[PDB]
Structure formats: C-alpha cells, structure tokens
Symmetry: C3
Subunit: 545 residues, 3 copies
Amino acid sequence: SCSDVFQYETNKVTRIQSMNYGTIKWFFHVIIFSYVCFALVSDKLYQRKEPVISSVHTKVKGIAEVKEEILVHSVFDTADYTFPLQGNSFFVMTNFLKTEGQEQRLCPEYPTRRTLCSSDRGCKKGWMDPQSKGIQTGRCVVYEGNQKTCEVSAWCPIEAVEEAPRPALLNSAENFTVLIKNNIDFPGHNYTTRNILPGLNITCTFHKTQNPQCPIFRLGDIFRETGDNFSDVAIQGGIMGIEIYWDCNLDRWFHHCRPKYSFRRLDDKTTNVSLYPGYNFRYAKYYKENNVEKRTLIKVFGIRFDILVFGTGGKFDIIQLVVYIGSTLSYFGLAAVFIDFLIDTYSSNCCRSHIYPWCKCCQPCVVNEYYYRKKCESIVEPKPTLKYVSFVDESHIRMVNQQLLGRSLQDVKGQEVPRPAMSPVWCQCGSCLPSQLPESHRCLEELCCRKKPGACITTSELFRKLVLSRHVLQFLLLYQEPLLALDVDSTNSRLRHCAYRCYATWRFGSQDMADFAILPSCCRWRIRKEFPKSEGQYSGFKSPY
Amino acid sequence: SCSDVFQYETNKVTRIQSMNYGTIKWFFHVIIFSYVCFALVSDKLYQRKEPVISSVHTKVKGIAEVKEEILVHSVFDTADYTFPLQGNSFFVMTNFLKTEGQEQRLCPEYPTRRTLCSSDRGCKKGWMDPQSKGIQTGRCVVYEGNQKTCEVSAWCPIEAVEEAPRPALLNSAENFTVLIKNNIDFPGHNYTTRNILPGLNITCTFHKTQNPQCPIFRLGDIFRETGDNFSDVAIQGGIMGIEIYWDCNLDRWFHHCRPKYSFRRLDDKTTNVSLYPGYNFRYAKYYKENNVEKRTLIKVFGIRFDILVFGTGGKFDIIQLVVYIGSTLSYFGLAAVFIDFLIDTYSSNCCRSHIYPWCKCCQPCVVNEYYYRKKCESIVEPKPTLKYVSFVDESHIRMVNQQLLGRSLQDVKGQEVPRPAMSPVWCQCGSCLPSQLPESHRCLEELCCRKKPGACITTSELFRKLVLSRHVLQFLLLYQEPLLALDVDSTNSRLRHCAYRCYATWRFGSQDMADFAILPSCCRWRIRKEFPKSEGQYSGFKSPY
Amino acid sequence: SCSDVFQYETNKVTRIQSMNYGTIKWFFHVIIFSYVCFALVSDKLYQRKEPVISSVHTKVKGIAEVKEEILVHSVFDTADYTFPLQGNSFFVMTNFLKTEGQEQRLCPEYPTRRTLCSSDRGCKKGWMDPQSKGIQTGRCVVYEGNQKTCEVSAWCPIEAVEEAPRPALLNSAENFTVLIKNNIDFPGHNYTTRNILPGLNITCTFHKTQNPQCPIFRLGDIFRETGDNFSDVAIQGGIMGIEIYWDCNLDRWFHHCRPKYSFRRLDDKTTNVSLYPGYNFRYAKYYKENNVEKRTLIKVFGIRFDILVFGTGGKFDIIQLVVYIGSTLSYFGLAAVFIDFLIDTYSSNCCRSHIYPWCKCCQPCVVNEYYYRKKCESIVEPKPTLKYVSFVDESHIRMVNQQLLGRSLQDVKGQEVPRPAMSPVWCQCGSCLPSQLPESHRCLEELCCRKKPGACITTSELFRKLVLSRHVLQFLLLYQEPLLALDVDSTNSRLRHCAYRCYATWRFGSQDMADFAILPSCCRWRIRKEFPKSEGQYSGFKSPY
Ligand SMILES: CC(C)CCC[C@@H](C)[C@H]1CC[C@H]2[C@@H]3CC=C4C[C@@H](OC(=O)CCC(=O)O)CC[C@]4(C)[C@H]3CC[C@]12C
Ligand SMILES: CC(C)CCC[C@@H](C)[C@H]1CC[C@H]2[C@@H]3CC=C4C[C@@H](OC(=O)CCC(=O)O)CC[C@]4(C)[C@H]3CC[C@]12C
Ligand SMILES: CC(C)CCC[C@@H](C)[C@H]1CC[C@H]2[C@@H]3CC=C4C[C@@H](OC(=O)CCC(=O)O)CC[C@]4(C)[C@H]3CC[C@]12C
Ligand SMILES: Nc1nc2c(ncn2[C@@H]2O[C@H](COP(=O)(O)OP(=O)(O)O)[C@@H](O)[C@H]2O)c(=O)[nH]1
Ligand SMILES: Nc1nc2c(ncn2[C@@H]2O[C@H](COP(=O)(O)OP(=O)(O)O)[C@@H](O)[C@H]2O)c(=O)[nH]1
Ligand SMILES: Nc1nc2c(ncn2[C@@H]2O[C@H](COP(=O)(O)OP(=O)(O)O)[C@@H](O)[C@H]2O)c(=O)[nH]1
Ligand SMILES: C[C@]12C[C@@H]3C[C@@]1(C)[C@@]1(C)C[C@]3(C(=O)NNc3ccccc3Cl)C[C@@]21C
Ligand SMILES: C[C@]12C[C@@H]3C[C@@]1(C)[C@@]1(C)C[C@]3(C(=O)NNc3ccccc3Cl)C[C@@]21C
Ligand SMILES: C[C@]12C[C@@H]3C[C@@]1(C)[C@@]1(C)C[C@]3(C(=O)NNc3ccccc3Cl)C[C@@]21C
Ligand SMILES: *C(=O)CCCCCCCCCCCCCCC
Ligand SMILES: *C(=O)CCCCCCCCCCCCCCC
Ligand SMILES: *C(=O)CCCCCCCCCCCCCCC
Ligand SMILES: *C(=O)CCCCCCCCCCCCCCC
Ligand SMILES: *C(=O)CCCCCCCCCCCCCCC
Ligand SMILES: *C(=O)CCCCCCCCCCCCCCC
Ligand SMILES: *[C@@H]1O[C@H](CO)[C@@H](O)[C@H](O)[C@H]1NC(C)=O
Ligand SMILES: *[C@@H]1O[C@H](CO)[C@@H](O)[C@H](O)[C@H]1NC(C)=O
Ligand code: NA
Ligand SMILES: [Zn+2]
Ligand SMILES: [Zn+2]
Ligand SMILES: [Zn+2]
Ligand SMILES: [Zn+2]
Ligand SMILES: [Zn+2]
Ligand SMILES: [Zn+2]
C-alpha cells in the first residue's frame, strides 16, 4: 500500500569508543582520499580526452655546391633536391649516381660473377634474374676486351655496380633549414591552435633549452640531437623522425596548448645489403634526342624526414568525474570490512587458548569478545526436526537437529549450545514414564531430566513455585486476558500449556529455544497430573514451523 | 569533541544458519569473481593502451616486358612504373594510353555524339563542356573526310576516346615483389620495435601459414588472397590495402609485439562510367621540339597500394586496475540484496494464504517470517496526533494517528496494530465519566475500555493488584529513588502517574505505544480517585514529542 | 567448520514510517536513475568505440583558359595543374611565375639592396646569403647599364624578385570540381562501408542543406562556405581542409553510418613575408638544348586540399555496460548516508537548545531523537581501568576510566554517563569503613554511597528486600541450578557474590556497567557482614577483561 511506500530503513549500529578503531578508520579514510585525489589530478580523470587532428606545412631553405668529377662546380637549390611535403614527409637528396643516355636496346650486362659468361650456354633466353634490370636474349657478348657478359634487352647502357660516392655530394645539406608549421584541431572540443604564435621570434633556430619553441630546424642539429653523423647517413641515406607532442589542457583557467619537439631515427641502421640499407630510389629523366626516346637514370640517395604529430586535448566533463567518483566510493568501506574482520577473529577462543600465551602482546585484543557479543546475534533454521534438550546434571543445552530413527531422545546427543546468561531404562531419575504417543512418535518423549543418575528436577522447590503454582499460572493467563472466565477443563488445559511454557522458559531461557524445547517425561507427567484433561489423549510437542 | 572523533560504527547483524542462503551467497560470489577476472584478463583492463605511431618504407622489385603495337618489345623497370612511397601509399602502373606530340593549338574535337556537328550553329564560342578538354571557338570543322566536329582550343591533337588496352601491357606486374619495413613506437610507454627482426629469413615470400612474418609480398598473391584477378584489375586499375595490425603487450613477462598482415580491396568494384571506375590519372611529359613547346600525354592506369597500420600497446597501470576493481566491488552486495528481498517477500502473509496452497513446493519458505522478525523492527513517526487505544473485548490495538474533530475517541477507529507478544452514550461498560477538560479537548478522554457491551476492566483483579496496589507503586517509586520522602499530595501525584504508566504498560506493552496510549475514563477516574490531587484540575495526556 | 561456511549475515534494520524520509529516498533514487540512464544513452557508454581506418581517392575535373603576356591564350587541363592525391592531400595550381632557359653559369645577381655593389669590396668569394640562390665569386658586375650587382655561381639567369601575378592566371579554378571517395573500416567490429552508396545522385554538387551527401565539391563553394575569397587565395596560395566526420552506430536495430562534411582553412592568414605566406614551391623543368643542360624554373602557387577523416564506430559491449553499472551502483546509497546524517545531527541537544528557539520551523525535527535512540547503541572499551560509580544523592553515573594514583575513588570524578531508563574523611554517610586491601589497592574501595552529607543507602528498605533478602538470593541461585546443595561457607560466598550483583544491577542497570561498577564501603561491608566468609580476606573487584 501507499503507506508502505513511504518508509525508510536504517541500519541498527553499535557505536564503539575505542582509540585503536577510530584511528584505523581515519587512517584508512585519509589514505584512500589522498590516493583518489592524486589519481584524479595526475591522469586528469575529470577530463574528456580528444586525439589531435593535424596539418603540417614545411619550407626547406638552402643551396649546396656540388663537386662531381667529369671536376665541375654546380649549385643545387630547392628545385634540385626537394619537393613539397607529401603525407607529413619531406625528402632531401644528399647523394646521387647518374647514368646518361640510356636507350631501349640490346646490350651486354655489366660484368659481375652472375653475368660473366664463357659461351652462350651460360645464358638462357627470357631469363629474369631478380638482380638484373634486363631480360636475357640467350647469347652472351663482350663488355670490354676480354670480359664476356650475357646479353640483355633493357635500357642500355646498363648501370654500373658502384657504391654511393664518398663523401656525399650534398654534404652541405646539414646547413639546410626547415620551417615547420603545424595546425591542430580538437573537433569535439571545438578548439584549434598552431605552433607559431604572434610575437614568436622568426630568426632563431631550435634548441632544446634556449629556443625550445622555434620551429626552424637545422638538419645537422637534428642528427646531432639524435647522436648520428649527418656525413655518414648522407652517403647511403636514411629516415629521421620529427615528433611534435601536444599535451593540451583546454580548461580556461589552466589553459596550456604548446608543442614539445623531439627527434628519433626511423630507419634501421642495418649493414646487410640483403635488407637494402639506407634510403634510395631510381628516378628517370626522359628526353628526346634525334627523335630517339632516351633516359637519364639517377640513383637518388637522401634522408626522408617524417613529421609525427600526436597528442590529446582535455576539457572538464561531468560524466567522467561522476563515473570516477562512483568507481572510488566503495573503497571507503574497506575500513569497516577490515575492522569487522578483526572483531570476528579476535572473538575466537583460539586467539586466547594458544595465541595470547605465546604472543602476550595481543592480549588486550580480548575486548573483541564483548564487541562481537554486542554486534552479532546467531539464529538457526527453525526446521521441523529442530529440538532442544537440557539436563539438570549438565551445564549446557543440546540442539538435536536430527530425526530420531526410533532412538530415545535421551540417547540421541546433539550439538552443544550454551544456555543464555542472566521406571524406563533411559531414566536416570526414577520418576519418568513411558510415552502414550504412537510407537512411531514414542521416542521423542523418551527423555529424562538428567544424563547421569541422581535426584529429579521435579523435587526442586522452584518446580512447585513456578511450574505448578496455580496462582502464578492464573496470573499469567489473566495478564493477557484480564476478564477471563473458562470452564474447569478449559482452564486446566490452559494451565497445562502455561506450565509447559514456564518450564521451557525457566530451563532454556530464550523463547527461540523454548519453542522447540522438549519436556522430560517426569516433568511432563507431573504437569499433566496437576492439570489433567477430562477426556482423550495428549498430542505433545508440535513445531511452530 | 575529540573522543567523539575516535569512534567506530559497526552494523548489527543477524547470522542465519541456512544451507539455502549460504549456498546462494557463495554461488553469487563465485560467479561474480569469475566474471570479474575473465573480463579483466580478456580485455586487459589492468593495462593502459597507447595507439601506434608508424613509419613505413617500401621497396618494389621487378621488370616487365611490354608489347605495344606501332609491334615493339620494351622493358619497364622501377624508374618506369613506380615512384617512392608517399603517405603510406605506393603506385604501380599496369596499363597506359599514350598521345604523342600535343601542341597548344586549334583542332577539331574527336568525333562523338556531342562533338559531331553539321554547321556552325551546333557549336558556341567559349563553351566549356564538362566532358571536353578544350574550349569551343564557335565554328565546327572536319576531323576526317565526311566527319564534322566542333573546333576547340586545347592541346592538340585531342585524345581519342578509347578503352584501356586488353590485356594490360604490364600484366607481368603480378610477379613484382614489395618489401615493407614498418617502424612503430609507443611514446608514452617509451617502446619502439620493427617488423624485421635479426635472423628473419630474407629470401622468403609471405604466406599466411608458412611464412606469416616474411615482409616480402608478391602482388598477385595479395590479389589471390583477396579473391581478385590481377589481370582484370590491371586493365582499368584499382586500390588495394595492406593491413598491419599490432596487438602488443609490453609487460616484460608476457611480452609480445609482432605484426599481423591482412589484405583488403579498397576501391569500389563499380562498373558505372559515371563514377569513374578503377584508378587512372593523366600525366604530361613536356618537351621542346623546334623551339615549339610540346606535350606527350599518358593516361596512366594502375593499382595503388595503401599500407594501413593500426594497433595498440598495453602496459600494466595501477590506476586503471584500481578503477576497475572499484567499479566491480559493488556487485558483491547483490547476494545480500536478493536474499533480503526473498526474506521480505516470503514474510508476507500473501505467500501463505494463496501461494502455498497452490504451489505446495514453496511451503518450507515460511521460515522467512522468523527471519524477518529477527531482522526488522518497525516504528512510526511520533507525531503529536499519534494515539493508541486498546479494548478489553478486542484482541488488537488501534493507532489513531488522526485529529479528533470533536469526535469521541471511542467512535474514531484507527489502524489495527497487533499487541506485542510475550453513564455516557459511548460507554459500553457503565463506569465511565464525562471529561472535565475544555470542550475542545473533551473528546480525547471520551473513551471506554471496550467496544461492545459487557463487564469493565476496572473490576479485574489484576487492576487492583497492579494499577492500584499502593505497595507496588511505592516500590516502583523507590527503585529509582531509594531514599525518597515526599509530602502527601506529592506522593499521591507520583503514585497517580505511576498508575497511569502501569496500566499503559500492562495493556500496550512496549513503551513506544504506552507513551502515546490513552487511558479509558473508567480506569482514568478510578486511578484519580485512589490517588487524588489536593487542588486543581488534571491536565491529562501530553505527547512527549 | 563446514556448517560455519553455510551462513548468511543480514543487517538488522529499523523501518521508519515517515513521509519526509520516504519522499527524500525516492526523490534521490529517481534523480540518480534518470541521470544514470541519460549519461548511458548520451555518451553511449554501453558501446565499445573503435577509431576509423580510412582510404581516400579523389578525381579533379576542369580546364582553365590562361592569359600570360608574351598576349597568348592557353588551355590548362588536369595534366597541367594537378597530380594524383598523395597522403590524403591533392594540389591545384592557381598561379605561376616562369623563368626560361637557366644554365649553370656565372651571372650578376638580380638587383636588390643586398646585391647592389659599387666595387669588388662589397662582395666576398664563397658567400652563401640565406636570401640568395647562388654563391658569390667575390667580384661584382653590371646587371643592366648603371646597375652594379654581385656575381654569383648559380642557375642563370637569376629569378627576378617579382610578386605573384594579380589576377591569378588560373582563377577559373574555382569552377573546378572534385569527387571524393572515402572507404572506411572498423577492423575490430569487422565493418566497412563507403561514402557513395548505390542510388546516390551522381550529377549533383554538395550543399549543406540541399545535397549534404553529394561527394562532388566545387572549390569556390568550399571557400565561400569557409568565408574566404578564392580570387585572393589563388594569388599567393593556401591550404584548405575538407573534414569527413564518421559518427557510426553499428547496432543493427539503430544502425547509421554516414559522413558529415565540413570545411576549415588550415593555413595561417599571415601577411608577414618572414613567415612565408601562402603556399608555393619551386619546380624545375629540365631539358637539353644543343647538348647544354638547361632548366625552366616555375614558381608554383596554388591551394593544397587536405582531406581529414576522423570518427568512431560503436557496437554494444557487455563488459563496458557491466563496468558502467558497477561504477554507478554506489550512488544509490547516498540517500541513506544523507538521511542518517540528518538523524545524527537533529538528535544533538544543540539543535534544540539554540536552533529551534530561533528557527521555529525546524522544531518538528525532534523525532530524530527517538529515531537515533532506536538506531544506535553506544558502548565503551572494557579496559581494565574502566569503572562506574553511582551516588544516591546524585542523578547520574560516573565513568572513571582513569587510574587512581593513590586518590580515593570518592574524590576522583569521571565522565558523566546517564543511568539507563526503565568514619573515614571521604564518607558523607557515616557507615563506611577503611579498606583491608593492600595500601596500593586501598583507594579503589574508598568510596561512599553519596557525594554530599545525608542518609545512607543501606538504610533504604529496598536494600534489605533485594540485596540482603536471603530468600531472594537463594531463589536466584536455584534458578540457574535447580538442585543446588552447598556447604555453609560456600553458600555464604555464593550469596555474597549474588548480593554484590543485585546491588550493581539495582543501581547501574545494564550488565555492561554493573560488571565494572564499584560498591560503596558501606554497602560492601553490610553485605560482607550478612554473608561472611569463614576464613581469609576478600579480593574485591576484578575486571572481567
Ligand atoms: C576526488 C574526489 C574525492 C573529489 C572531487 C573533486 C572535485 C570537486 C573537483 C575535481 C575536478 C574539479 C574541476 C576541474 C576543472 C574545472 C574547470 C574550471 O573551469 C575553467 O577553468 C574554465 C571555465 C570555463 O568553463 O569556461 C572550473 C572549476 C572546475 C569545474 C573544477 C571544480 C572542482 C572539481 C569538480
Ligand atoms: C580481478 C580482481 C578481483 C583481482 C585482481 C587481480 C590482480 C591481483 C592482478 C591483475 C593484474 C595483475 C598484474 C598483471 C601484470 C603484472 C606485470 C608483471 O610484470 C612484468 O611482467 C614485467 C616486469 C616489469 O615491470 O619490468 C608483474 C605482475 C603484475 C603486476 C600482475 C600482478 C597481479 C595483478 C595485479
Ligand atoms: C542505466 C541502467 C540503470 C540500466 C541498464 C539498461 C540496459 C538494460 C540497456 C542499456 C543498453 C541496452 C542495449 C543497447 C543495445 C542493444 C543491441 C540490440 O541489438 C541490435 O540492435 C542488433 C542486434 C544484433 O546484435 O545483431 C539489442 C538490445 C541491446 C542489447 C540493448 C538491451 C538493453 C540495454 C542492455
Ligand atoms: N515446547 C514444547 N511444547 C510442548 C511440549 N509438549 C507439549 N507442548 C505444547 O502443548 C500443546 C499440546 O498440549 P497437550 O498436553 O497435548 O494438551 P492437548 O493439546 O489438549 O492434547 C502443543 O501445542 C505443544 O506446542 C514440549 O515438550 N515442548
Ligand atoms: N500515556 C498516557 N499518559 C497520561 C494519560 N493521562 C495522563 N497521563 C500523564 O500524566 C500526566 C498528567 O497527570 P494528571 O492526572 O493530569 O496530574 P497533574 O499533572 O497533576 O494535573 C501527563 O504528563 C501525562 O503524560 C494517558 O491517558 N496516557
Ligand atoms: N562489579 C563488582 N564486582 C565485585 C565488587 N566487589 C567484589 N566483586 C566481585 O566479587 C568477587 C570477589 O568477592 P569477595 O568478596 O572478595 O569474596 P572472595 O572471592 O571469596 O574473596 C569478584 O569476582 C568480583 O568480581 C564490586 O565492587 N563491583
Ligand atoms: C622528385 C625530384 C625532382 C627533382 C627534385 C627531387 C625531389 C629529386 C630527388 C631530385 C630531382 C632532380 O632532377 N634534381 N636535379 C639533379 C639531380 C641529379 C643530378 C643533377 C641534377 Cl640538376 C629528381 C627528384 C627525384
Ligand atoms: C610518376 C611517374 C613517373 C614515371 C613513374 C611514374 C610513377 C609513372 C606512373 C610512370 C612514369 C613514366 O614516365 N614511365 N615511362 C613510360 C610511361 C609510358 C610509356 C612509356 C614510358 Cl618509358 C610517369 C609516372 C606518372
Ligand atoms: C607536379 C606538377 C607536374 C605538372 C602538374 C603539377 C602538380 C604542377 C603544379 C604543374 C606541372 C606542370 O608542368 N604544368 N604545366 C605548366 C606549368 C606552368 C606553365 C606552363 C605549363 Cl604547360 C608541374 C607541377 C609541379
Ligand atoms: C584461531 O582460530 C585463529 C585463526 C585466525 C585465522 C585468520 C588468519 C588471518 C590471515 C588472513 C586470512 C584471510 C585472508 C585475507 C587475505 C587478505
Ligand atoms: C587487537 O585487536 C589489536 C588490533 C590492531 C589492528 C591493527 C593491525 C595492523 C594494521 C594497521 C593498518 C593501519 C595502520 C596503523 C593505524 C594506526
Ligand atoms: C504476495 O503479496 C506475493 C507478492 C510477491 C511480489 C513479488 C513479485 C516478484 C517478482 C519481482 C518483482 C520485483 C521486480 C524485480 C525485477 C528484477
Ligand atoms: C524459499 O524462500 C526458497 C528460496 C529459494 C531461492 C532461490 C530462487 C532461485 C534463484 C537461484 C539463483 C542461484 C542458483 C541456485 C543456487 C543453488
Ligand atoms: C549543533 O551542534 C548543531 C551543529 C550542526 C553541525 C552540522 C553542520 C551542517 C553543515 C554540513 C557539515 C558537514 C559537511 C557536509 C558537506 C557536504
Ligand atoms: C527535519 O529533520 C527535517 C529534515 C528535512 C530534510 C530536507 C533537507 C533539504 C534537502 C532536500 C533534498 C531533496 C529535495 C526535497 C525532497 C522532497
Ligand atoms: C566553435 O567556436 C567558434 C568560435 O566561438 C564558434 O563560432 C562556433 O560556432 C563553434 N562551433 C561549435 C560547434 O560550437
Ligand atoms: C626510453 O628508453 C631508453 C632506453 O632505456 C632510455 O635511454 C630513455 O631515457 C627512455 N626515455 C624515457 C622518456 O624514459
Ligand atoms: Na561501487
Ligand atoms: Zn527420569
Ligand atoms: Zn526427573
Ligand atoms: Zn465505560
Ligand atoms: Zn470500563
Ligand atoms: Zn559513607
Ligand atoms: Zn552509605
């Protein structure tokens, strides 16, 4: 119903005044809070992070004087050694080998171990060797005087097998400069900036400490920063990376979005000719001469510069913070978990029978028995099999949560449960009687008031004062029903049930065990004698559940 | 104060010994733990993941013999069909159409339905048709004999409308090979590796099962892996993707960082000429002849190869693990939530009046009444309107949480609350009196000890023994105050209040309801008669809150 | 043991029937649930998001008529102004400056303030000025008539210092069109689509409202959308971005994966010649004439178009949802936290001594005293120092949790703890005796039954009826042990301990304080007199812990 909707359930709690546990709780809380704040701040987990969208534009500057034997002096400018940056990469030629006046013809292949012949049996028509730029015609010819080489159809004359010139022809390229312009954007945060801001000095050159924001770089300085020789790499070529890192905060109070420049060599410094060391490619300059289609082939060596731009942009997001705080909230209950674990452990009698005698340091931890007593109440499943038995000659109570398979309840021994703090052959007292229940159910009432021979509880004065005092029982009956008037037999039955309940409460205490207790035949039949029923038999114990 | 800071609050708990609930709890815990660990391991949620920064370098190898009618045999090498990779893409020409000796002149447009004229009225000066490479001069001319075509200013002669040669001139390109070198880096984790490790065989060719790590690829094998014909795609061209996936673990015990190669066609296999099928572009070879600037135009067909590199690098991060564990911790309370829900539901009398008779399987679930009784205590808001009434002729108690609008409290009936387990016209007993309170407040005390006619509770012996026994009341007064001596009137007032409290405790039990109970006028005035006040009137009930 | 494994612990709870607190709880729950669902839906936190892998293919269309004084009319087509897209960028030439017939020679540098000389002393051999394309020879020469300029080795004739032609020669480029084909993939989700779907109109041009999915773009329309003049940018050049955003949902019921097109200028609109405004590069057309190697240098201006493709693909993931729900679960306990805080605060007597008199609105909040009483039980650490004292002439109990340093317990005053609701010189009653304990421990028993002079509690009738009634004590002894028979001295000792316990229970109530209470010497020695021990001395109080 509606009134049941408008309810609040609050947990019952025990507040303990202990320095140890308060100190532990506050220590836990302080450490957890400090770590939570540190993790939130260091990794900015209140921020939503967007990756960078980048555009790069480069401008290389410089000329080189080149000496090539033929000796001639020539000047190379940007139109001769570089092309506009494509795909965030730009290339600078540093060395070249040139092969003028090639024609599509038949020619002898350049002398090598493979191409050196002695007759037309060393060559096969149509042969495509992976190390040749031509197709064999099956007959081998003279390259020069004694030298005999296989004939090929190809661009002729064939390139000579020659190493890259040493020193590199454009070794002056280390004095070339490149200006890098980097445009970035965070489309989700709707923010874009660039690496060159107004006021930036435009005549500087980059230095990691002196000019760490000048976007003009001398190539030799890059190689020096990486620990490489420009002179050696310029001979066979290579690949160098220019890294631009953007760690940007777009909160207007803490706003900072500037690039960090870094350098990394990207080509493997392999010396294995099988892996094609360096960076080179073959380029054809086509031209017509005498109506004959000709080709000048250049083997180009140089350094490719890859501009690598990465990073993130962060702005405060409420949902991310809400998620993080929720992910952290459950860590504040670990103090309670740990302290309750301590209470449960140091309440074990083990921790006092063995541990404390050895480690006498841990002895004051015995207060946890009191704490556990004030914290936890233990109950059992009220199964129909549940039964409780008490012996006057003993000092504990027995939970017979087991089915009597024709065994006298006196014989069946159950679990030992402490009492709350504030003639048959199974009879050890000589005042018990055999049950009148059916033979199947006769064993439940085959119980005596004691385990070992001696006196009977029915002779105790308290038995006559509490269980059998008709005045006490009538007062109890009238307490619930002030104006109660009943017949003789009805009143006798009422007083009989009241006497059963009074005995059970006296001997077992808690109504939990009194509801499932079992009266001895001595006390049972004493009560039934004092308050008999007019006619019929007695049902006996019925489990409430 | 400081001592209040050093406190620990622990929840009071009821420990139940039930196989069903323990089994359910442990089942829940095991399933949740297993799923948590599985999710942590499968998606590596203890790791911080960084995307890959990649650099690619390619080396294509191979020559082709080309037959072009004019028939001539020519050899094409890398300088004739490819250029160094730009932007993680490289191109291989497979077919071409050539148009020699173009001049900037006036010429007839090549015959088509659009360009075919019959007079100068079919053409307009300055016309830029989207399907023409020239600008009309307004007059149409003869292309060949009878054919009449519009004149255009353009590069002349105009290209013929011709389909790509079939078969492709460089169909041998399927035997070309490409070596791919891939450098990758994780700048945050400060890790870089590459796809070619020392010891790798350098003469192999890729195969998904036999050589899945050889970075040398035959192009025809790529197309075969994708399910395409190289011969057909080589005619009009296309785009093919080479995917390099890096799923890298940078934990030094579980370290693995190798690439997985895959292939995907990237061009749409469209046959609609409107959508420009294939891959082709027009390229101009410029040359000077007789001081006349000339152009050889080549329509280039071929396959563009895009190298697509993606992936992540993971290393263990403490903060990510802490966040994940916190996000999971709250799932371990669902067992308690569910079991407490069961206890609350099966404690409803509904579950026994209707459910159990039908479904006799669920009958043993009635233990939850006991469990709920031991778990929850229900209390009400102690509003000033709160009132409790008991009738001796009834068996329950009435909570009149309502304002008496001049209505006798005997008439006003309230909610039925169970009792704790252990003459006026509204008078049905004939010993009640009218109230002496103000007429506004006279209705609160217009209550009888019973709802239906009969005897009076004041005649009950327990009334004289408990409520009026001066010895009992003085013992109660002296229990709190051992050495208590008071005047006659003060003692009478004390005993009067004690008698009120004794009646309320006897009939209503709990002090919660006794504090808000209402004495009947019969018992009220009996008590006031036995312990009168010397002078003045009687205030009556005051709500403690 | 196993039976201890099969246990379920449930929290004891107090269910309150209050409109305010139920309403607050349900308000909290509804708000939290609504926000949780909103955050889940808006940011799709049930989805796993994959970044896009993209391939772009472009097709530019259009011809331009160009007027260059020399006046001549020429037609430029794609082979003359564009090259196939590389690295997701394509370039269109819009302007050019041409320098024909360059030779590697010695020449006078073009006249400028820097290059203008008056003698060979203004020039130095080997000089590489950053603003020169040549190397000085040390001697300066005549450029034209009177003009004197430094001689340089370079490609000669040297380029003239001239501004870009105005108007741009290819200003008709704004009528060029580009068709963009975009292939994307989500490898983890195994999904790929493209921007041109079957049925898409192929004759349209993009418009943000009319044709927002046509992938054909007129360049002038792009610049108009960005708010730029194509005519002005075409003179010196620039860079324009075409953004393709993919916000894709791959759930088959909510599936949507289409691109959103956007435009952004990427070059800085700088007018500083130092920063190299615009976009231009120098390109060499090499040719042989009379066996002399010659060069035609073109300074190329134009607009570079960068295709920027970004986005994410989301598909439902169970683990992400499980993590999010767990991160949110702990927010549903904030209602309990807040309401329990209210209960604790409004239970403070402060909130009634000062607050309510001022703010009489908050007065009904006094029910929280009852709620707190029903919620929390407070206990103290049972340290060996713990002691409780009661004075008959006072109305509270004193917790002396302090070590008596030879100070009489009568003098030592401790914390004031309320009682549970239901002759020596330190003696103010004249019936106390000095202790027989050792002088070190004699001060604990130096306590009287009152703080101020007057009568003694031992004269109270309740003292004789409860503490000394031998019948009461024997009944108490026999309640635990029905058939108890003991010697005279043993029975006297039993009754003495029982009398101590009865006094402590009478005066201190709770067994928690009765276990640590201290009997006055008057009552102590009265009891010891009524139930003496045959021989020896009396130990006295021992702390149970
Ligand atoms: C770690 C747990 C236990 C405590 C939670 C701490 C929060 C209260 C902190 C963490 C992040 C903080 C935020 C970090 C960033 C900003 C942005 C800041 O705004 C700006 O700097 C720009 C202003 C603009 O938005 O235009 C205003 C404060 C605010 C919301 C801060 C408010 C305080 C917050 C929410
Ligand atoms: C799922 C919940 C309920 C339980 C939490 C399990 C953790 C205790 C596991 C998960 C991830 C594990 C870590 C996974 C990876 C590593 C890296 C490993 O280090 C290395 O392999 C490299 C050594 C180096 O750092 O140089 C050492 C163990 C450690 C910290 C593992 C320790 C055990 C961890 C923290
Ligand atoms: C926010 C908290 C408190 C409540 C949790 C809500 C969930 C029950 C919702 C959120 C996301 C939902 C899912 C969103 C997407 C899908 C995919 C949908 O499948 C498809 O659309 C494609 C079918 C296919 O997989 O082929 C089926 C429903 C499902 C699983 C939804 C089921 C209901 C879910 C799990
Ligand atoms: N706890 C408990 N209750 C008992 C025992 N014996 C009888 N009762 C209660 O007394 C009632 C049976 O009383 P009984 O002597 O048979 O009189 P009858 O019902 O008129 O036949 C049942 O409801 C039982 O719950 C017992 O040994 N232990
Ligand atoms: N619970 C309850 N308390 C009552 C009732 N009638 C009187 N009292 C208490 O008794 C006190 C009034 O006693 P009263 O007979 O008027 O004597 P007076 O105070 O000297 O006038 C108040 O504090 C009430 O709380 C009642 O019907 N129910
Ligand atoms: N709480 C409490 N217990 C006491 C006090 N005095 C004695 N006792 C208890 O009584 C026992 C000592 O009794 P005592 O008179 O010395 O007789 P004895 O043990 O035979 O010497 C101890 O176990 C104490 O716990 C007291 O002042 N307060
Ligand atoms: C793409 C090109 C065009 C230009 C610029 C460049 C990036 C370069 C490496 C050199 C190249 C060129 O042709 N440079 N000129 C030259 C090269 C070798 C010897 C003498 C001379 Cl004049 C070819 C080329 C492959
Ligand atoms: C950029 C170029 C330069 C080289 C290499 C390449 C990648 C190519 C496709 C072919 C090209 C070239 O010029 N190849 N040569 C040729 C082409 C057709 C007919 C006869 C011959 Cl010899 C032009 C070009 C567009
Ligand atoms: C790479 C090239 C090749 C083609 C296409 C292009 C992308 C262009 C900008 C123009 C270029 C070319 O040579 N265009 N032709 C021309 C240029 C200026 C004056 C007269 C004429 Cl016919 C050079 C080049 C740098
Ligand atoms: C007497 O029975 C003493 C036994 C104490 C058992 C408790 C042992 C404490 C060690 C931790 C056990 C639980 C694992 C917790 C891992 C963090
Ligand atoms: C007896 O029960 C004493 C228990 C003491 C528990 C402390 C065990 C060590 C764990 C300490 C962790 C917190 C740091 C110390 C807080 C002051
Ligand atoms: C007598 O009143 C029996 C009524 C039982 C009502 C409980 C119905 C159980 C079905 C679940 C209802 C809550 C929704 C839980 C969804 C997971
Ligand atoms: C009476 O209250 C019996 C309640 C039984 C509750 C079980 C309901 C089915 C849910 C089971 C989920 C866990 C799997 C079975 C555990 C053994
Ligand atoms: C009498 O002692 C009244 C004192 C009341 C103290 C409580 C003050 C309430 C304000 C909040 C204090 C806790 C901080 C909570 C921040 C969300
Ligand atoms: C006396 O204890 C009255 C306490 C009232 C607490 C409410 C304080 C304001 C916070 C309200 C937040 C929820 C919105 C209102 C719910 C109806
Ligand atoms: C981005 O910021 C600019 C400058 O304030 C504004 O004009 C524009 O509308 C913003 N775009 C979005 C998507 O809000
Ligand atoms: C990265 O690793 C190398 C090799 O150990 C080390 O020299 C370098 O300092 C590291 N860089 C960082 C940022 O720690
Ligand atoms: Na949580
Ligand atoms: Zn017996
Ligand atoms: Zn017996
Ligand atoms: Zn009446
Ligand atoms: Zn009456
Ligand atoms: Zn005294
Ligand atoms: Zn005294």
